[PDB]
Design a binder for this molecule. Structure first.
Ligand SMILES: [Zn+2]
Length: 326
């Protein structure tokens, strides 16, 4: 089966531009990232501050922002949860959805920053919205029926031992909410010819979920055959960036190889699951293996690898540009 949207290769000019960074771009990203490098456990003041910062940053860019708030039972009692959904053009039928979670694990051993999990992904999504703002606002005027949507899930982490009932609180809630929210092509702006739209979940054209990013030398694989055409664009973009000499490497004459051209046999539970169960196509941008710092007190700021983060930001910027033809 072909991808429902013909995927036009990024022109060289655009690839080079998406692959550059000024030191002020680096500084802008780091400034954004500092806002997330704090404990943000569900129910806490800093958690509320982080949500407020996400919401304000995106409202300031003239995105439509929904705070999807609810209370849910947990092994620790009733807890408040608030997903944040930012949509560049609400009326556009189809959404390229980029996602991550913004809560941090309540770690039994002490204060836990969750720098890779997922403070960096949070910052990457905001940095994309900020750095591509002009181009995105231009794209929004086309009436082409496609837009960008950013979802910051709350309550990804378990309070106790990960289970179907203790984990993915925000994503389980949102997927069900959108599945039950009925709509059709006539109510929406420029749906593709062959689109079957019965509810809001059908408008998610593909969900690209970023998680556990920020450690050196991540290895990604295509986890879903369904989105192999999309995944292959990340492979190609990374290859073109290396060919252009636009990746930061430790030594001359090396290449990044983050996006492997293989598939793996690996089952990961994450925020994508409740959407996958409802036929949303998923690209899961998560390393295999997980970073060594995963769910340890060492998942902190100093253990981030900034050259890797810069390289990923170039891939992601080029990918959004290519998908939306910015
Ligand atoms: Zn985690």
């Amino acid at each position: 089966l072909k991808w429902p949207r013909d995927l036009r290769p990024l022109a060289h000019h655009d690839l080079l531009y998406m692959g550059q960074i000024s030191e002020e771009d680096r500084g802008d990203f780091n400034a954004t990232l500092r806002n997330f490098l704090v404990p943000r456990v569900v129910g806490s003041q800093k958690h509320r501050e982080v949500r407020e910062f996400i919401v304000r940053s995106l409202k300031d860019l003239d995105w439509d922002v929904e705070e999807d708030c609810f209370d849910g039972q947990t092994p620790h009692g009733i807890k408040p949860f608030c997903n944040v959904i930012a949509t560049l053009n609400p009326s556009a039928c189809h959404r390229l959805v980029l996602a991550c979670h913004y809560d941090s694990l309540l770690h039994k051993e002490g204060t836990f920053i969750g720098a890779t999990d997922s403070a960096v992904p949070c910052a990457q999504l905001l940095y994309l919205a900020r750095s591509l703002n002009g181009k995105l606002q231009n794209q929004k005027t086309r009436g082409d029926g496609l837009t960008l949507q950013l979802v910051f899930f709350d309550g990804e982490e378990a309070f106790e031992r990960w289970s179907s009932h203790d984990s993915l609180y925000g994503s389980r809630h949102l997927a069900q909410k959108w599945h039950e929210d009925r709509t059709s092509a006539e109510r929406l702006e420029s749906c593709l010819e062959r689109s079957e739209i019965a509810n809001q979940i059908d408008r998610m054209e593909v969900m690209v979920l970023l998680d556990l990013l920020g450690a050196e030398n991540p290895r990604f694989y295509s986890y879903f055959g369904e989105t192999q055409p999309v995944y292959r664009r990340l492979v190609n973009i990374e290859s073109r960036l290396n060919d252009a000499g636009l990746m930061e490497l430790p030594r001359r004459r090396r290449r990044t190889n983050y996006f492997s051209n293989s598939s793996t046999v690996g089952f990961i539970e994450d925020d994508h699951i409740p959407f996958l169960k409802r036929s949303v196509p998923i690209v899961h941008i998560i390393p295999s293996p997980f970073p060594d710092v995963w769910h340890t007190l060492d998942d902190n700021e100093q253990n981030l690898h900034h050259p890797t983060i810069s390289n990923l930001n170039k891939i992601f910027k080029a990918f959004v540009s290519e998908y939306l033809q910015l």
